[PDB]
Amino acid sequence: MIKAAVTKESLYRMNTLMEAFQGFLGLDLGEFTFKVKPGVFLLTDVKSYLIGDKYDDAFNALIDFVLRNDRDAVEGTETDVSIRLGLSPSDMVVKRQDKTFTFTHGDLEFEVHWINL
């Protein structure tokens, strides 16, 4: 049901990295949720969903996931993809890797992706 997408130490800075991936997993608008943290950014699809405490145990714990791990240094499944950087065509899609994996924190399970721009 829920599936997250993230970025670590993004070269682009947040700058609304929420709108970069913008639910590249299954969100149209407002359906997406994103937590901004230094060196670790979380974009989740928790529209009508919370773990229990309004972003607790993943949606700011996956932050920890990315924070103890690193891109490539993860047990994941990488795909070559491209994402639009929030803004207009001038802010053209960048070539990035989609590192597919699962973040299992105790209460929830969701297909999370490393969206390293």
- One-letter amino acid at 61 equals A
Ordered by start, the domain boundaries in the chain are: 5-116
Q: What is the DSSP string of the chain?
A: ----EEEES-TT--SSTHHHHSSTTT--SS--EEEEETTEEEEE--SS--SSSSS-SSTTTHHHHHHHS-SSSSS-EEEEEEE--SS-GGG--EEEEEEEEEEEETTEEEEEEEEE-
Phi and psi at residue 18, to the nearest 5°: -55, -40
CA distance 69 to 50: 24
In this structure, what token pair is assigned to residue 97?
Answer: 């890797």
